[PDB]
Design a protein around this nucleic acid. Structure first.
Length: 165
DNA sequence: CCATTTAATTAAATTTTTTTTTGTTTTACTTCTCCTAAAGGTTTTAACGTTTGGAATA
């Protein structure tokens, strides 16, 4: 009851809603974290594309593309192996090196969440994917910790307040 | 005181006829079955993702 609950998937007018309702799903905190990670890594991909003097392999949503093979291509970042070796990439701006090296399993679960889009109607098959507890509690919570570490260090790297989420 | 007869009538087997019944045949509607179509739900396949061993390394 508390807060603004008027935003419901019954967004028609009294009779027309009485006839049919908007397509909708169940939202829960864990899928919300999945979405946060998703949007933030979309932002990260956009910034890479912007400062890149080469293509951005992390920007292709095709099928045969697999985060596994791309990871195998690029590999763990030197000063932090949990990250990825984006330091060697080619930027039109001066290479910041390690600065652009996100974690590993975070990107894995990001890609698996992304490949959801093929059939959104099977929403639950990936609704929670990134932050799933499939112990695994430690694994996924520390993955969230690593992701938010990347988020904050990026934000500080460009003066962005951590509160802009 | 009355026996005579025949004249009219009936009765009856006989004939012939007409009908009536029986089996025969032909043909048409009549149900009985299927074929056909539609759609739906049930099953079959597939895909991804999960978790787990398999192999090698630090």
């Amino acid at each position: 009851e508390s807060g603004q609950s008027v935003d419901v998937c019954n967004e028609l007018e009294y009779p027309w809603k009485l006839i049919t309702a908007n397509n909708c799903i169940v939202s829960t905190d864990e899928s919300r974290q999945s979405q946060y990670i998703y949007r933030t890594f979309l932002l990260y991909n956009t910034v890479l594309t912007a400062i890149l003097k080469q293509n951005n392999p992390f920007d292709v949503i095709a099928e045969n593309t697999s985060i596994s093979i791309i990871v195998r291509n690029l590999g763990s970042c030197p000063n932090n192996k949990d990250r990825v070796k984006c330091c060697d990439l080619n930027y039109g701006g001066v290479p910041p090196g390690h600065v652009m090296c996100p974690p590993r399993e975070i990107t894995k679960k990001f890609f698996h969440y992304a490949k959801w889009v093929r059939n959104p109607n099977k929403y639950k098959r990936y609704s929670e994917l990134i932050a799933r507890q499939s112990h695994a509690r430690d694994v996924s919570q520390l993955h969230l910790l690593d992701w938010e570490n990347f988020m904050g260090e990026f934000s500080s790297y460009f003066g962005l307040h951590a509160h802009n989420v």
